[PDB]
Amino acid sequence: IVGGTASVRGEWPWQVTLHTTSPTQRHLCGGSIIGNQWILTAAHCFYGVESPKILRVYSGILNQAEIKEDTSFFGVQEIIIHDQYKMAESGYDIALLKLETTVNYADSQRPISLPSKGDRNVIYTDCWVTGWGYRKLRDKIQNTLQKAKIPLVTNEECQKRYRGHKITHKMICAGYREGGKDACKGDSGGPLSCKHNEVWHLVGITSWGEGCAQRERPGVYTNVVEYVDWILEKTQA
């Protein structure tokens, strides 16, 4: 995360850290707990990943340092990627990670509610992007989960910032006109939590963006509300 500040323990209960063990153990992506056995994340995060056996999901984490050989984690039983996904830039960059066992909700790890097409007068004005990503193009994974308040920008306005891509309705952008704050390398898969009516809604999934926190270059996230039907369907037996 760029232009943000250190988060406090237990602040973002739904935020997890996805690790890969190949070739060695390291933070690969972020992800959100939406079910006691379901992590919503980005499809491109598994680029190259042949088997979910090398995956590790760590809940209730604040400092990457907390991860050790003895540290408990959740194994992934199956990687579910949207059947229409081709290229993160084009959209459909969404994936479900089905854990082998269930999570026990606690103050340090809980599910974040999904948006609903049935919601009324939805106006997100309290959005936050979280993750252990870079703090500046060409950096390194952070130890402490970083957060940053970022304003949503309309699809139209964003379409103008990205004359190279086709910002579809299934995407959502966020960022200041002058930049300074945004998600960066390592935050993909992370949640884009926004306050609706005293309740947190997983509005978007960290997907991409030209550079990191560049002016007139907003972060692009997968627009979750547009996939709720997919999620419910895929989460169903």
């Binding site: 830039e89 960066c184 390398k185 390592g186 993909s188 963006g209």
Partner: protein
């Protein structure tokens, strides 16, 4: 070309360990790929990268 392009991470924000052929060094080297975009000089393993761009083995 495929073995002469600079390692480009791409617009995606993931941490994917990959390999690219460095012309200066005359050998393959690691680099973090974002997950999407980039160019053909992007391989999963050192051996594969060397198999495509490496010298007479």
């Amino acid at each position: 070309e495929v073995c002469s392009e600079q390692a480009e991470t791409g617009p995606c924000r993931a941490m994917i360990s990959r390999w690219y052929f460095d012309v200066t060094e005359g050998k393959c080297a690691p680099f973090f790929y974002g997950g999407c975009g980039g160019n053909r000089n992007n391989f999963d393993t050192e051996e594969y990268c060397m198999a495509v761009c490496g010298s007479a083995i």
